[PDB]
Design an enzyme around this catalytic site. Structure first.
Site, PDB file in Angstrom:
ATOM      1  N   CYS A   1     -14.516  21.892 -10.847  1.00 43.20           N
ATOM      2  CA  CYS A   1     -15.558  22.637 -10.110  1.00 43.20           C
ATOM      3  C   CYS A   1     -15.903  23.776 -11.241  1.00 43.20           C
ATOM      4  CB  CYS A   1     -14.979  23.415  -9.257  1.00 43.20           C
ATOM      5  SG  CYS A   1     -16.271  23.852  -7.865  1.00 43.20           S
TER       6      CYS A   1
ATOM      7  N   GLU B   1      -2.006  30.132 -10.592  1.00 39.03           N
ATOM      8  CA  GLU B   1      -2.630  28.931 -10.846  1.00 39.03           C
ATOM      9  C   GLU B   1      -3.245  28.897 -12.335  1.00 39.03           C
ATOM     10  OE1 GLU B   1      -6.774  28.480 -10.007  1.00 39.03           O
ATOM     11  OE2 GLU B   1      -6.325  26.467  -8.875  1.00 39.03           O
TER      12      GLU B   1
ATOM     13  N   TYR C   1      -7.307  19.850 -14.271  1.00 41.95           N
ATOM     14  CA  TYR C   1      -7.385  21.060 -15.708  1.00 41.95           C
ATOM     15  C   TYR C   1      -6.345  21.133 -16.585  1.00 41.95           C
ATOM     16  CZ  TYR C   1     -10.620  23.008 -11.933  1.00 41.95           C
ATOM     17  OH  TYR C   1     -11.908  23.075 -11.233  1.00 41.95           O
TER      18      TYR C   1
ATOM     19  N   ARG D   1     -20.290  24.088 -11.846  1.00 40.83           N
ATOM     20  CA  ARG D   1     -21.267  23.369 -11.041  1.00 40.83           C
ATOM     21  C   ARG D   1     -21.517  23.860  -9.647  1.00 40.83           C
ATOM     22  NH1 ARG D   1     -19.218  20.338  -7.698  1.00 40.83           N
ATOM     23  NH2 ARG D   1     -16.779  19.839  -7.631  1.00 40.83           N
ATOM     24  N   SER D   2     -20.339  24.236  -9.065  1.00 41.63           N
ATOM     25  CA  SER D   2     -20.633  24.682  -7.635  1.00 41.63           C
ATOM     26  C   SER D   2     -19.900  25.782  -7.180  1.00 41.63           C
ATOM     27  CB  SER D   2     -20.204  23.239  -6.892  1.00 41.63           C
ATOM     28  OG  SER D   2     -19.973  23.508  -5.607  1.00 41.63           O
TER      29      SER D   2
ATOM     30  N   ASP E   1     -19.064  28.482  -4.153  1.00 44.42           N
ATOM     31  CA  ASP E   1     -18.908  29.117  -2.466  1.00 44.42           C
ATOM     32  C   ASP E   1     -18.967  30.611  -3.167  1.00 44.42           C
ATOM     33  OD1 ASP E   1     -18.205  30.140  -0.277  1.00 44.42           O
ATOM     34  OD2 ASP E   1     -16.978  28.759   0.132  1.00 44.42           O
TER      35      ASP E   1
ATOM     36  N   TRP F   1      -4.076  23.577  -3.362  1.00 44.51           N
ATOM     37  CA  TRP F   1      -3.501  22.325  -3.809  1.00 44.51           C
ATOM     38  C   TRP F   1      -2.688  21.427  -3.233  1.00 44.51           C
ATOM     39  CZ3 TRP F   1      -6.659  20.493  -7.908  1.00 44.51           C
ATOM     40  CH2 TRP F   1      -7.303  21.478  -8.554  1.00 44.51           C
TER      41      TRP F   1
ATOM     42  N   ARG G   1     -20.209  29.135 -33.051  1.00 42.45           N
ATOM     43  CA  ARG G   1     -20.974  28.739 -31.734  1.00 42.45           C
ATOM     44  C   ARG G   1     -20.494  27.575 -31.083  1.00 42.45           C
ATOM     45  NH1 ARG G   1     -25.348  30.622 -35.878  1.00 42.45           N
ATOM     46  NH2 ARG G   1     -25.337  28.407 -36.360  1.00 42.45           N
TER      47      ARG G   1
HETATM   48  C1  LIG Z   1     -15.646  24.900   1.212  1.00 45.08           C
HETATM   49  C2  LIG Z   1     -14.457  25.560   0.096  1.00 45.08           C
HETATM   50  N1  LIG Z   1     -14.720  26.742  -0.295  1.00 45.08           N
HETATM   51  C3  LIG Z   1     -14.048  27.143  -1.264  1.00 45.08           C
HETATM   52  O1  LIG Z   1     -14.334  28.074  -1.805  1.00 45.08           O
HETATM   53  C4  LIG Z   1     -13.025  26.411  -1.802  1.00 45.08           C
HETATM   54  C5  LIG Z   1     -11.769  26.498  -2.693  1.00 45.08           C
HETATM   55  C6  LIG Z   1     -11.105  25.651  -3.142  1.00 45.08           C
HETATM   56  C7  LIG Z   1      -9.955  25.889  -4.032  1.00 45.08           C
HETATM   57  N2  LIG Z   1      -9.908  27.407  -4.690  1.00 45.08           N
HETATM   58  C8  LIG Z   1     -10.426  27.781  -5.816  1.00 45.08           C
HETATM   59  C9  LIG Z   1      -9.433  28.396  -3.831  1.00 45.08           C
HETATM   60  C10 LIG Z   1      -9.483  29.770  -4.163  1.00 45.08           C
HETATM   61  C11 LIG Z   1      -8.748  30.486  -3.238  1.00 45.08           C
HETATM   62  C12 LIG Z   1      -8.312  30.015  -2.320  1.00 45.08           C
HETATM   63  C13 LIG Z   1      -7.894  30.518  -0.812  1.00 45.08           C
HETATM   64  O2  LIG Z   1      -7.541  29.720   0.108  1.00 45.08           O
HETATM   65  N3  LIG Z   1      -7.412  31.796  -0.639  1.00 45.08           N
HETATM   66  C14 LIG Z   1      -6.820  32.283   0.616  1.00 45.08           C
HETATM   67  C15 LIG Z   1      -5.974  33.007   0.291  1.00 45.08           C
HETATM   68  C16 LIG Z   1      -4.615  33.140   1.209  1.00 45.08           C
HETATM   69  C17 LIG Z   1      -3.543  32.497   0.783  1.00 45.08           C
HETATM   70  O3  LIG Z   1      -3.699  31.190   0.452  1.00 45.08           O
HETATM   71  O4  LIG Z   1      -2.587  33.077   1.071  1.00 45.08           O
HETATM   72  C18 LIG Z   1      -8.042  32.830   1.174  1.00 45.08           C
HETATM   73  O5  LIG Z   1      -8.311  33.898   1.182  1.00 45.08           O
HETATM   74  O6  LIG Z   1      -8.679  32.043   1.975  1.00 45.08           O
HETATM   75  S1  LIG Z   1      -8.838  28.249  -2.140  1.00 45.08           S
HETATM   76  C19 LIG Z   1     -10.834  24.468  -2.520  1.00 45.08           C
HETATM   77  C20 LIG Z   1     -11.855  24.122  -1.530  1.00 45.08           C
HETATM   78  C21 LIG Z   1     -12.897  24.844  -1.070  1.00 45.08           C
HETATM   79  N4  LIG Z   1     -13.494  24.598  -0.128  1.00 45.08           N
HETATM   80  O1  LIG Z   2     -30.340  20.610 -30.632  1.00 44.49           O
HETATM   81  C1  LIG Z   2     -30.064  21.699 -31.253  1.00 44.49           C
HETATM   82  C2  LIG Z   2     -29.540  21.659 -32.464  1.00 44.49           C
HETATM   83  C3  LIG Z   2     -29.448  22.755 -33.377  1.00 44.49           C
HETATM   84  N1  LIG Z   2     -29.996  23.684 -32.893  1.00 44.49           N
HETATM   85  C4  LIG Z   2     -30.004  25.021 -33.718  1.00 44.49           C
HETATM   86  C5  LIG Z   2     -29.304  26.159 -33.173  1.00 44.49           C
HETATM   87  C6  LIG Z   2     -28.450  26.870 -34.356  1.00 44.49           C
HETATM   88  O2  LIG Z   2     -28.202  28.140 -34.843  1.00 44.49           O
HETATM   89  C7  LIG Z   2     -27.973  25.506 -35.355  1.00 44.49           C
HETATM   90  C8  LIG Z   2     -26.729  24.646 -34.932  1.00 44.49           C
HETATM   91  O3  LIG Z   2     -25.900  25.408 -35.571  1.00 44.49           O
HETATM   92  P1  LIG Z   2     -24.443  25.500 -35.033  1.00 44.49           P
HETATM   93  O4  LIG Z   2     -24.439  26.268 -33.599  1.00 44.49           O
HETATM   94  O5  LIG Z   2     -23.731  24.126 -34.855  1.00 44.49           O
HETATM   95  O6  LIG Z   2     -23.314  26.079 -35.738  1.00 44.49           O
HETATM   96  O7  LIG Z   2     -29.122  24.892 -34.994  1.00 44.49           O
HETATM   97  C9  LIG Z   2     -30.650  23.927 -31.710  1.00 44.49           C
HETATM   98  O8  LIG Z   2     -31.321  24.968 -31.559  1.00 44.49           O
HETATM   99  N2  LIG Z   2     -31.069  22.710 -30.913  1.00 44.49           N
HETATM  100  O1  LIG Z   3     -12.782  26.280  -8.077  1.00 40.72           O
HETATM  101  C1  LIG Z   3     -13.433  26.034  -7.041  1.00 40.72           C
HETATM  102  C2  LIG Z   3     -13.412  25.043  -6.354  1.00 40.72           C
HETATM  103  C3  LIG Z   3     -14.051  24.672  -5.182  1.00 40.72           C
HETATM  104  N1  LIG Z   3     -14.968  25.743  -4.824  1.00 40.72           N
HETATM  105  C4  LIG Z   3     -15.782  25.435  -3.756  1.00 40.72           C
HETATM  106  C5  LIG Z   3     -17.362  25.264  -4.005  1.00 40.72           C
HETATM  107  C6  LIG Z   3     -17.733  24.276  -2.981  1.00 40.72           C
HETATM  108  O2  LIG Z   3     -18.995  24.463  -1.874  1.00 40.72           O
HETATM  109  C7  LIG Z   3     -16.606  23.328  -2.882  1.00 40.72           C
HETATM  110  C8  LIG Z   3     -16.559  22.300  -3.666  1.00 40.72           C
HETATM  111  O3  LIG Z   3     -17.234  20.949  -3.211  1.00 40.72           O
HETATM  112  P1  LIG Z   3     -18.054  19.949  -3.994  1.00 40.72           P
HETATM  113  O4  LIG Z   3     -18.545  20.710  -5.216  1.00 40.72           O
HETATM  114  O5  LIG Z   3     -16.918  18.859  -4.457  1.00 40.72           O
HETATM  115  O6  LIG Z   3     -19.269  19.381  -3.266  1.00 40.72           O
HETATM  116  O7  LIG Z   3     -15.532  23.996  -2.889  1.00 40.72           O
HETATM  117  C9  LIG Z   3     -15.355  26.748  -5.826  1.00 40.72           C
HETATM  118  O8  LIG Z   3     -15.998  27.372  -5.354  1.00 40.72           O
HETATM  119  N2  LIG Z   3     -14.630  27.006  -6.621  1.00 40.72           N
END
Ligand SMILES: Cc1nc(=O)c2cc(CN(C)c3ccc(C(=O)N[C@@H](CCC(=O)O)C(=O)O)s3)ccc2[nH]1
Ligand SMILES: O=c1ccn([C@H]2C[C@H](O)[C@@H](COP(=O)(O)O)O2)c(=O)[nH]1
Ligand SMILES: O=c1ccn([C@H]2C[C@H](O)[C@@H](COP(=O)(O)O)O2)c(=O)[nH]1
Ligand SMILES: Cc1nc(=O)c2cc(CN(C)c3ccc(C(=O)N[C@@H](CCC(=O)O)C(=O)O)s3)ccc2[nH]1
Lengths: 287, 287
Positions: B174, B66, B114, B194-195, B197, B88, B154
């Protein structure tokens, strides 16, 4: 022991940890820093509390006027100076602009910075006097819609990081994105800050996003929850370690509290006259 | 209470902290989750270590194929299926596409996800078979040039969060952005997720960005440093609490190590036959 203000004590321990464990580097022009990569702190916003540090006063008028300026979508630094807030003055004057090659740009036109990205992400920027109504994505309106209609969402995000527009920014975003989060009627906010000067900028950023959360909480009819502050490069500047040595030996007072003295029809309906800050007590200024 | 693999033990305590302190909520998919908002852990990559969890095996082939798929810039899910990686697949077939209103889209065209954002941020997407050369920002190339020529910066950042393109994505990003960091010739990387599991996706993402850091480090002639993993909604699903209780009682083995068996001309010059994973020992599968 328990401290009256634990959240600010932890911030001081952050500064203390940077000085003890950070790596000493010369940023680029010689000027040294002490830096840790990767830090996180949490600050309680419940009951209207706002994390304005008490061991070193914060430019509250700057936080307030700048944040309203962000929300309005403005990229014209001259509007902030008309409020007597000079934080963006050096970054938008002739010398600084010409140094970046913006030799054709009016003074104070900061480019497609925060306000533009928050309210018109993806729009074609030209200058700070252009009507961008209906252009780009209104991230701040989408966030407020998500909180109201989909409180459980894990995609409530607002980013100021636009690679296409970075070139035309006087300064690349520092607080690059934030995420919101609803739990038991409480609105929380996590901020990712790529770079943070713990001596000056960071306390200011905590107040900005703390205040922003309080505003969005009121618009969505929610209560304030928690501010999560994530840092990339958390650093102190070498030449200013003396000031922090002083700040660390101070016991924090209680945080002040925000109070909104009238109702608001939207996030765009705020004004400086109705954002009240109660009981902000600080330690004396630091040379 | 020492451990051969401290970094994975802290992960087990993360899951543990989620279970004890997390808030119980029902998300938009039904079926409850236990969640903490705001978490951060660090995993050492030095000396070629890669954080592939040993208490629960990770789909290493998925991680590897991936990530190369991302780097190539591809948004065509069918290329991943030709490698026998079926993540996917359901997200890009007829049923799922029509449900989102992409009734005109070829099967497997996942949209501007991505790969498109990493290498062509801000470009006008049309389909997964279009030549986007010279369109948008090549964030991955920008990051590498920054690491080589401006290691102290930075602002070494790569984001997958494009509000303009979210509508056309089969799945919103994600792992939303990452930041890199150089210190005494050691390359570090912070990921904001952001999220997460903690039972499935998070262990996978730690390896993805762990491998990515190892790859970029080699291209720039650096050594691997630290992976900082920041989480927004870090959660466990109430359905799998039994399994994690077992996993938590397991003592982690040592992490495996990555070893690149040939040189590379660029980040685009990698192949599965030359990314080796040494000594990946796991605990047995869990019902
Ligand atoms: C609820 C939820 N949890 C997740 O972790 C999640 C992850 C993805 C995508 N993602 C980031 C994934 C990473 C790894 C994966 C996976 O299914 N691995 C299998 C391996 C077996 C195989 O595919 O052959 C597994 O172990 O379940 S899926 C999509 C929806 C999701 N939904
Ligand atoms: O909202 C802001 C803007 C700037 N800085 C500070 C952190 C830094 O060291 C410098 C920004 O420089 P650069 O990270 O852009 O290089 O100003 C903050 O703390 N907060
Ligand atoms: O790269 C990824 C993609 C998905 N998820 C999991 C976390 C979640 O609970 C769910 C995403 O659902 P939402 O964030 O869209 O609600 O899949 C991961 O952990 N990593
Ligand atoms: C090295 C550096 N550190 C910073 O913290 C920083 C911050 C900004 C912008 N920013 C995020 C600021 C927030 C608050 C500020 C400030 O100047 N505060 C002064 C009062 C200035 C005034 O009264 O006009 C202060 O409180 O001492 S500056 C710009 C460049 C920087 N550069």
């Amino acid at each position: 022991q328990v401290h009256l203000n634990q959240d600010e004590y932890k911030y001081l321990k952050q500064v203390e940890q940077i000085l003890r464990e950070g790596t000493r580097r010369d940023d680029r022009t010689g000027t040294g820093t002490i830096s840790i990569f990767g830090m996180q702190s949490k600050y309680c916003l419940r009951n209207g509390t706002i994390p304005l540090l008490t061991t070193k006063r914060v430019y509250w008028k700057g936080v307030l006027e700048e944040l309203l300026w962000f929300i309005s979508g403005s990229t014209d630094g001259k509007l902030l100076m008309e409020k007597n807030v000079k934080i963006w003055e050096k970054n938008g004057d002739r010398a600084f602009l010409d140094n970046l090659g913006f030799t054709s740009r009016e003074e104070g036109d900061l480019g497609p910075v925060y306000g533009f990205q928050w309210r018109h992400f993806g729009a074609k920027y030209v200058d700070c006097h252009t009507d961008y109504s209906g252009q780009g994505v209104d991230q701040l309106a989408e966030v407020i819609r998500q909180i109201k209609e989909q409180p459980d969402s894990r995609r409530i995000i607002m980013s100021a990081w636009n690679p296409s527009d970075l070139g035309q920014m006087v300064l690349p975003p520092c607080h690059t994105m934030c995420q919101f989060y609803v739990d038991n009627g409480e609105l929380s906010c996590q901020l990712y800050q790529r770079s943070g000067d713990m001596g000056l900028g960071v306390p200011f950023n905590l107040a900005s996003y703390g205040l922003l959360t309080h505003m969005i909480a009121k618009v969505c009819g929610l209560k304030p929850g928690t501010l999560v502050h994530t840092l990339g490069d958390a650093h102190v500047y070498s030449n200013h370690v003396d000031a922090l040595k002083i700040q660390l030996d101070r016991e924090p007072y209680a945080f002040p509290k925000i109070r909104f003295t009238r109702d608001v029809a939207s996030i765009d309906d705020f004004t400086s006259d109705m954002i009240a800050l109660d009981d902000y007590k600080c330690h004396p200024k630091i040379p």
